[PDB]
Amino acid sequence: TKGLVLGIYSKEDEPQFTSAGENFNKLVSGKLREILNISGPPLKAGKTRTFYGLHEDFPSVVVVGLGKKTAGIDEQENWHEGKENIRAAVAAGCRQIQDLEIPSVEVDPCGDAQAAAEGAVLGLYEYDDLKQKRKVVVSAKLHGSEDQEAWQRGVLFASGQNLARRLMETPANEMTPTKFAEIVEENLKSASIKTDVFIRPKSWIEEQEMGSFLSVAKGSEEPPVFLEIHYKGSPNASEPPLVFVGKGITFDSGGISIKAAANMDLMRADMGGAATICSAIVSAAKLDLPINIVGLAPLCENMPSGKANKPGDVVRARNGKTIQVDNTDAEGRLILADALCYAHTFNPKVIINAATLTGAMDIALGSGATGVFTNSSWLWNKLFEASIETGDRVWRMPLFEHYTRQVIDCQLADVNNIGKYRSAGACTAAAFLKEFVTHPKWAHLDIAGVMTNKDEVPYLRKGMAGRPTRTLIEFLFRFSQ
């Protein structure tokens, strides 16, 4: 009827199966084991072999390599590793069932119900919607029934990421500053009714004296929308929140300080800041976590025009500081100077802001880890441990006065959007944001390296990657528990 993804590990006496696999073997009377011998070598991690007709009801039994049984927290790679194995191995498996055009598939728990699910789902995602030529929409349910609460945690966690991936991925002619808000609000409210949304317009942002976010929007004729998310998880409402901020340039052309045509079509994902953290709240509300969280994301676009932000321009952020706007492409810095200032109104506990800010971050670490600066070692620890679990790494980066210094000397004004020199890119830019933050637990997460995937993460197909959404989710789970 449908396919099945089985798992196996490496040697002992004969490479052991995952118990779903062992079970299914006994069932076809050893002949899965038997054909595995006959087929070729053994399956190291992530490798895949497909055995037809072993079962009546399962034409295609794909067996995938799970690596070491006891594979675990790796001191170097900074993650759990079995999980990492399982994720690529059922991803590998599920993409084989999807190429066999099998619309539904059943999947080995593989000892970590959650991981096989985040594999099956992250693994299968595309963003098919605008091609009439699409792959089969395969349905992936668990195999078994003993462990359902964590496989659904898989499908949950993986989906909230897939959310961001479709929110980033979609062309910025479709996924606008409004349509992004429309979907989010819709996603947050279908997540829980303990939620309020505020797709605040130009008038309110004007009213908020958000000079800097506004200076940015004015290039396009597409409207600014400052978005406000709320989830009231806490039993006592009055618990002060955790506030997520996120940059939402739906399209970045650089503005007057205009980009090269070389791969500028990826700037449709310069709203990844906004998308990631939004998907995290949509997800923390599906988990319905005992915490009040607040999504804040200035959605607008960077374009050149007769009224676009010019080089040399001093503008006023909400907080009273002026900014020389020396480079119109350093604009997340300005959109974020204001929603950061607004974050403090909420009396937060943690202000995690996130953004696709600098290509320099990409030059830095580049899709390994999502670089995170933070005046909180406590906070750093927290994001990092969560990243160990989820596998979407995070690497601390420096928030040193050294860097502030460069941004702070300024011809016209109080702060400059680009620092004195070429060097230290993400640090300069994070140094600019701290000028707009007085809280003891702030975290900049520059996501410009994890904006995309090709092959680097196995279980993600090519296209917007939606990172580090699950590490953000997992952090708020653990902070709630």
Interface with a copy of itself, residue 38, by CB under 8 A: yes
- Residue from 4, 172, 197, 372 touching a copy of itself (CB under 8 A): that is 172
- CA 66 to chain centroid, in Å, comes to 25
Nearer to Zn ion, 336 or 472 (CB): 336
Choose the contact partner of 38 out of Zn ion, Mg ion, a copy of itself, none; CB within 5 to 8 A by kind: a copy of itself
Nearer to Zn ion, 230 or 268 (CB): 268
Q: Are 218 and 197 in contact (CB under 8 A)?
A: no
Sign of the alpha-carbon torsion through 353, 356, 361, 365 = positive
Nearer to a copy of itself, 322 or 469 (CB): 322
How far apart are the C-alpha atoms of 21 and 230, rounded to whole Å?
A: 44
- Residue from 106, 326, 331, 392 touching a copy of itself (CB under 8 A): that is 326
Contacting Zn ion within 251-270 (CB under 5 A):
252, 270
- Residue from 21, 109, 332, 371 touching Zn ion (CB under 5 A): that is 332
361 annotated as ligand-binding: no
Q: How far is the CB of 34 from a copy of itself (least distance, A)?
A: 8
Contacting Mg ion within 217-256 (CB under 5 A):
252
* Measured CA distances, 44 to 63, 108, 181 (Å): 11, 17, 44
Q: For residue 259, indicate whether it is catalytic.
A: yes
Choose the contact partner of 400 out of Mg ion, a copy of itself, Zn ion, none; CB within 5 to 8 A by kind: a copy of itself
How far apart are the C-alpha atoms of 195 and 183, rounded to whole Å?
A: 14
382 annotated as ligand-binding: no
Q: How far is the CB of 218 from Mg ion (least distance, A)?
A: 15
- Angle (CA) 288-166-360 rounded to 5° is 100
How far apart are the C-alpha atoms of 247 and 251, rounded to whole Å?
A: 11
Interface with a copy of itself, residue 77, by CB under 8 A: yes
Contacting a copy of itself within 6-35 (CB under 8 A):
35
Which region among 15-23, 108-116, 166-174, 347-355 touches a copy of itself (by CB under 8 A)? 166-174
Nearest in space to 473 (alpha carbons), one of 279, 298, 291, 333? 279
- Residue from 108, 112, 118, 169 touching a copy of itself (CB under 8 A): that is 169
- Residue from 231, 251, 442, 475 touching a copy of itself (CB under 8 A): that is 251
* Measured CA distances, 338 to 42, 178, 205, 245 (Å): 56, 19, 10, 10
Interface with Mg ion, residue 326, by CB under 5 A: no
Sign of the alpha-carbon torsion through 445, 450, 456, 461 = positive
268 annotated as ligand-binding: yes
Which region among 115-123, 147-155, 381-389, 412-420 touches a copy of itself (by CB under 8 A)? 412-420
Interface with a copy of itself, residue 311, by CB under 8 A: yes
Give me the catalytic one of 47, 259, 310, 420. Answer: 259
331 annotated as ligand-binding: yes
- What is the spatial order of strands in the sheet that 313-316 belongs to? 313-316, 322-325, 415-416
Contacting a copy of itself within 352-411 (CB under 8 A):
360, 362-369, 375, 377, 393, 395, 397-403, 405, 410-411
Interface with a copy of itself, residue 440, by CB under 8 A: no
- Residue from 29, 173, 345, 438 touching a copy of itself (CB under 8 A): that is 173
Q: How far is the CB of 434 from Zn ion (least distance, A)?
A: 19
Give yes or no for a cis peptide into 201 (omega within 30° of 0): no
Interface with a copy of itself, residue 50, by CB under 8 A: yes
Q: Which residues are annotated as a binding site for Mg(2+)?
A: 252, 329, 331
Q: Kindly list the catalytic residues.
A: 259, 333
**Footprint on this chain of Mg ion (rule: CB under 5 A):** 252, 329
Q: Which residues are annotated as a binding site?
A: 167-168, 170, 247, 252, 257, 259, 268, 270, 329, 331
